[PDB]
Design a binder for this molecule. Structure first.
Ligand SMILES: NC(=O)C1=CN([C@@H]2O[C@H](COP(=O)(O)OP(=O)(O)OC[C@H]3O[C@@H](n4cnc5c(N)ncnc54)[C@H](OP(=O)(O)O)[C@@H]3O)[C@@H](O)[C@H]2O)C=CC1
Ligand SMILES: CCCCCCCCCCCC(=O)OC[C@H](COP(=O)(O)OCC[N+](C)(C)C)OC(=O)CCCCCCCCCCC
Ligand SMILES: [Zn+2]
Lengths: 181, 115, 124, 359, 112, 240
């Protein structure tokens, strides 16, 4: 956790000998670092004088010579097509059901019905004349309940912590720290 | 939040006659502040010419027929007034507005490159 | 003169002089492109009236330098491979065909490669 | 100004140079010329340099005051206004000021003398040496500027050297040298409108009886533009002045009302009348005590001379420009020294002239 | 559409009086065999008879006073381009694209 | 008090060849696609008089309405408990001159309540006004002020509409496609007038249009179908 750390465990220059004892006797919080980085540790091999020979990293499926056809991993051309649902298609889905839950006849009798919603069908009329169970089953939810706005993050929850856990300002300060839960 | 000085609501008028009353009213408002325009902007010309050139720009749009053109030219009409009153433009802009200025013969334009 | 100083040539005529400020480059007199502005005409300008022409940038002309290199000669192979002698810090690797009885220069570096069997005719 | 300073885009000089202009005449355009304004850091030089560089004409500005030349560069695009350090006691510098030029302008001149230069060395020696070097440097056109009463027979030293200065130019450069003789030029921060506004004017009655003709400094600047760009003006002498006659005593009082300055003008020292033998004495002393150019003895003699118009020379109608009257331009040049703001038009100023002379 | 919409656009008067626009569809390039840049209609303005390009004296740049030199508009229908040009009151002229004439091509034709 | 480790020298993990799964990034939005589709339809059913159409892309739901349907749909999405979009984040536009109404005004609403974002699209022409949402959302005061400055859209009902970005007395609306990127004029300091003055545009180096060398081949295909299998009209099966 983020508990206080002894000063000699931080990479900054610190006093030694008699001055260390003076520094601990006079400072308010003896484990506060001066902030001057250790000359012998900080950036000691400069970025231009390293020893690591860099190698280009390549994950196997997308960098392999084999089993690596580009059309498998060509996601830029598998983008979701843009589909706009007008009132007419909503009516057609509402009256005829969906592809998963068909409510359309078969053969030429069905092909008659689909062609009905192949041209303009205002949705105001469709709701006026249809089974009230359809709205409770298709349009609304859970037996007539409304459709709440969907959440971008179903795992977004919060909970209240206390200073013994979040380490920040005590209870008197006018802010509260929220965890995940 | 509250609007600034000399502000007006933006409403799209639907009657031709209604607009002209607003248009005529606005014209004196330009004329009324003309001396202050000279004083605040330290203009080098007497206020008479300031009243002179205001009138000309109104006439430039006098003969518009379609209504939707009438509103936008009135919406922007108010905005230029509001900026002028509140000293929002700088002295450089106002001077250059009133400091603006027969075509050459065919030989003359031909001689100097024309356009 | 102003005859060599204002026309590009494959090779110069007189020996270049480093102190002559009118030369196109300190190691070459005439320009090396048909559309390159001569240095004599470039500095005959008002902006140079009170300048010190000896301190203006005069990099050594690269055409004269590259022809001072020897020709690489390949042994028992008509194809040379060049990569700029730096690998990942050179130019892309390009294969040069040496069937013709001449020295074919590399597209990027400008190094000239030939065959060993053709050296005697080439060196004539 | 306008949009194009030329009448044609091809202009051939006396020396066979073919100068082709490019562009519409704005900042990025060029005219192909290359002027050299001497004393461009002076009062008149700044307007003249500004107009030339505004239209893409390269201008070489010889200078001696390093800081005073910095503001000249704002007028021109990159590489347009060039700076050459020079001194009229140095010849090499002047031979580099005119080396690449196609027009030479000479605004150097003085009405005061200094410990290092006299009026003889400046109005005569410098102009001569410029024209001699500008001729040997193959310059097609030279424009020179002198005083409004250039007369080599004048007892005043200013018009003695200014008059001789005209000769030594044409005797050095040749019979092509144009000459301009502007009247007292009034402008913002002008030497003329300054002493009219100065409060403690010692010896006011002695100095302000001199009569002149006002002339716009911009018109002088625009006139010099028309002269350089026209080859039909070679060897011609121009006497630039205004129409209406004004006296400094009239102006010093007409100005007084605009400034709005009872007991105070007398107590503040606005009027400081002086016996002339004292003024000749105090101005005598400041020639060798003051470190700054003070109102000297020679300037005193000029106050005894009204402006003379040499009617054998040319005017603004030759250039097709209407001279601008000080009536419409006096007010805008005293606003720096100046309820409702009191604005004077042409009618307001002329009426104010009537009040001063009315007892 | 019918309105003089240019009176609200704040554009300089010279685009109405002094410049000519062109409505055209870009032609297929000879070098490449792609046929996609020739499916959208574009509007470009004519160059100026002087001051379109001139060489900067100092660095040899390409100076210009034409503020429409790098302005090309895109459309997807020909009518939208013409309607938009009409709305602004532009003095345009339309360039009808050429249409390639169909010719059937057969592998066997090399001998028959 | 042990000496500090030299982090340069401490041992590092060894890896052989790395493996990372390749899968379509658009798949992980699958659950979000259905729920926005349901909630998009819900708004349309509630307000068939206004919602022309609705569209879903990955995790973004758009509602397309007329200018006269703006205040109604905005109010519904603000006050309805099932969709409490109290916060309006963005008001903007876009210019498509080919369409009859070029400008396309877009609103983005945030529901801190249910952690959702919705988008309203409403068109406009150069002269046709659009209702102002300032009476509903006070945060649109400046977003509408900016759209007018850069698109010239008339906003009906705005308490104080004026330039916010461009200079005072700036002629033309910059983000319109017909407005050149370098504008029409430029400023400089004139010595004679002792003031900064406007002059017509004149570039020392004219802008170079490298955009002509675009691709002559179509670069991305027709896309892929990711509609939920509960929002496609069923195919009427063939008869025996
Ligand atoms: N209202 C007016 O101003 C009138 C003036 N004239 C004459 O016009 C001419 C131009 O003067 P103006 O511009 O108006 O005002 P200035 O008197 O300030 O101009 C004098 C110019 O000459 C230069 N000069 C003087 N001595 C020297 C010198 N030893 N070496 C180099 N340069 C020197 C000055 O350079 P620097 O600035 O660095 O000192 C300055 O640029 C003068 O001869 C003047 O007599 C005639 C009629 C009206
Ligand atoms: C304390 C000493 C003051 C000396 C000032 C002085 O002597 O100044 C006056 C003289 C004159 O020269 P000027 O000032 O340039 O004349 C220009 C001003 N007019 C037009 C009024 C003439 O200067 C000299 O000869 C300076 C020589 C060095 C003197 C010692 C320093
Ligand atoms: Zn190579």
């Amino acid at each position: 956790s983020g508990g206080p750390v002894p000063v000699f465990k931080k990479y900054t220059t610190g006093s030694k000998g008699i001055w260390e004892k003076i520094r601990q006797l006079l400072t308010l919080v003896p484990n506060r670092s001066t902030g001057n980085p250790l000359v012998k540790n900080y950036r000691v091999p400069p970025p231009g004088s390293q020893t690591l020979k860099y190698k280009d990293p390549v994950t196997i499926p997308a960098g392999d010579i084999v089993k690596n056809q580009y059309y498998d991993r060509d996601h830029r051309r598998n983008y979701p097509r843009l589909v706009a649902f007008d009132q007419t298609k909503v009516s057609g889905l509402l009256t005829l059901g969906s592809a998963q839950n068909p409510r359309i006849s078969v053969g030429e009798k069905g092909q008659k019905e689909l062609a009905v919603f192949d041209q303009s069908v205002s949705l105001s009329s469709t709701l006026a004349t249809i089974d009230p169970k359809v709205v409770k089953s298709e349009l609304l939810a859970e037996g007539g309940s409304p459709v709440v706005a969907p959440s971008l993050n179903k795992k977004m929850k919060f909970r209240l912590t206390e200073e013994s856990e979040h380490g920040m300002y005590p209870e008197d300060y006018p802010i509260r720290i929220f965890a995940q839960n | 939040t509250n609007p600034t000085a000399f502000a007006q609501t933006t409403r799209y008028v639907k009657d031709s006659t209604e607009m002209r009353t607003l248009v005529l009213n606005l014209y004196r408002r330009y004329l009324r502040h003309s001396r202050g325009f000279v004083n605040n902007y330290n203009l080098d010309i007497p206020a008479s010419q300031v009243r002179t050139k205001i009138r000309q720009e109104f006439e430039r749009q006098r003969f518009v027929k379609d209504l939707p053109l009438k509103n936008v030219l009135y919406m922007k009409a108010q905005m230029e007034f509001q900026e002028l009153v509140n000293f929002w433009k700088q002295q450089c802009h106002v001077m250059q507005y009133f400091e603006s200025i027969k075509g050459d013969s065919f030989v003359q334009k031909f001689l100097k490159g024309a356009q | 003169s102003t005859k060599e100083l204002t026309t590009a040539r494959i090779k110069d005529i007189s020996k270049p002089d480093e102190n002559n400020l009118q030369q196109q480059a300190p190691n070459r007199i005439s320009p090396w492109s048909k559309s390159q502005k001569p240095r004599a005409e470039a500095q005959d300008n008002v902006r140079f009236a009170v300048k010190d022409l000896a301190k203006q940038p005069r990099p050594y002309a690269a055409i004269d330098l590259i022809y001072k290199q020897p020709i690489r000669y390949i042994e028992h192979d008509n194809v040379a491979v060049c990569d700029g002698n730096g690998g990942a810090q050179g130019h892309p690797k390009v294969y040069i065909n040496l069937d013709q009885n001449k020295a074919i220069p590399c597209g990027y570096c400008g190094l000239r490669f030939a065959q060993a069997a053709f050296k005697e005719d080439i060196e004539s | 100004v306008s949009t194009f300073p030329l009448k044609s885009d091809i202009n051939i000089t006396k020396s066979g140079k073919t100068l082709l202009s490019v562009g519409q005449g704005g900042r990025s355009s060029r005219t192909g010329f290359t002027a050299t304004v001497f004393g461009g850091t002076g009062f008149l030089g700044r307007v003249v340099v500004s107009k030339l560089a505004k239209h893409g004409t390269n201008v070489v500005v010889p200078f001696r005051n390093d800081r005073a030349r910095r503001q000249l560069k704002v007028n021109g695009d990159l590489g347009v206004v060039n700076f050459v350090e020079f001194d009229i006691r140095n010849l090499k510098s002047i031979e580099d000021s005119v080396k690449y030029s196609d027009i030479v302008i000479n605004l150097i001149g003085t009405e005061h003398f200094s410990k290092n230069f006299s009026i003889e060395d400046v109005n005569i020696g410098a102009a001569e040496r410029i024209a001699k070097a500008a001729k040997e440097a193959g310059v097609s056109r030279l424009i020179h500027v002198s005083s409004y009463n250039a007369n080599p027979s004048s007892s005043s030293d200013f018009y003695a050297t200014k008059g001789i200065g005209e000769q030594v130019v044409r005797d050095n450069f040749g019979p092509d040298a144009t000459i301009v003789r502007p009247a007292p030029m009034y402008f913002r921060n002008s030497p003329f409108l300054n002493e009219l506004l100065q409060i403690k004017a010692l010896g006011g009655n002695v100095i302000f009886k001199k009569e002149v003709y006002p002339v716009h400094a911009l018109q002088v600047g625009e006139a010099i533009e028309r002269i350089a760009f026209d080859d039909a003006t070679a060897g011609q002498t121009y006497e630039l002045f205004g129409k209406e006659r004004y006296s400094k005593k009239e102006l010093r009082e007409m100005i007084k009302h605009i400034i709005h300055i009872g007991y105070y003008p007398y107590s503040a020292g606005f009027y400081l009348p002086a016996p002339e033998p004292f003024l000749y004495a105090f101005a005598l002393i400041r020639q060798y005590i003051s470190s700054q150019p003070r109102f000297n003895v020679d300037q005193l003699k000029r106050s005894h001379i009204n402006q003379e118009i040499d009617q054998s020379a040319k005017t603004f109608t030759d250039l097709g420009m209407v001279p601008d009257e000080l009536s419409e331009y006096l007010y805008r040049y005293v606003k720096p020294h100046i309820q409702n703001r009191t604005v004077y038009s042409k009618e307001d100023i002329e009426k104010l002239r009537d009040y001063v002379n009315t007892p | 559409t019918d309105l003089a919409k240019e009176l609200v656009s704040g554009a300089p008067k010279e685009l109405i009086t002094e410049r000519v626009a062109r409505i055209y569809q870009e032609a297929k390039a000879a070098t490449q065999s792609g046929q996609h840049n020739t499916e959208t209609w574009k509007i470009d303005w004519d160059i100026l008879n002087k001051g379109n390009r001139w060489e900067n004296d100092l660095m040899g740049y390409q100076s210009s006073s034409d503020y429409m030199q790098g302005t090309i508009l895109k459309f997807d229908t020909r009518e939208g381009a013409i309607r938009f040009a009409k709305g602004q009151g532009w003095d345009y002229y339309i360039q009808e694209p050429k249409v390639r004439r169909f010719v059937k091509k057969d592998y066997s034709a090399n001998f028959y | 008090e042990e000496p500090l480790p030299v982090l340069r020298d401490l041992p590092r993990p060894e890896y052989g060849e790395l493996h990372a799964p390749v899968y379509n990034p658009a798949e992980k939005y699958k659950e979000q696609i259905e729920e926005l589709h349901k909630f998009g339809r819900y708004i349309m059913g509630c307000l068939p008089k206004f919602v022309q159409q609705f569209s879903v892309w990955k995790d973004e739901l758009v509602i397309y309405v007329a200018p006269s349907a703006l205040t109604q749909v905005a109010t519904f999405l603000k006050d309805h408990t099932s969709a409490q979009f109290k916060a309006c984040m963005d008001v903007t536009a876009a210019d498509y001159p080919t369409r009859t109404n070029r400008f396309d005004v877009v609103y983005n609403l945030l529901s801190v309540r249910h952690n959702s974002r919705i988008r309203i699209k409403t068109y406009a022409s150069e002269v046709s006004p659009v209702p102002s949402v300032v009476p509903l959302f006070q945060g649109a005061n400046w977003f509408e002020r900016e759209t007018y400055d850069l698109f010239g859209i008339f906003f009906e009902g705005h308490p104080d509409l004026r330039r916010i970005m461009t200079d005072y007395g700036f002629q033309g609306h910059p983000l319109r496609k017909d407005f050149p990127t370098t504008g029409y004029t430029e400023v400089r300091y004139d010595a004679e007038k002792r003031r900064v003055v406007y002059e017509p545009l004149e570039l020392t180096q004219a802008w170079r249009n490298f955009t002509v060398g675009s691709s002559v081949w179509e670069q991305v295909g027709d896309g892929k179908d990711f509609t939920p299998e509960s929002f496609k009209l069923p195919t009427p099966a063939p008869d025996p």
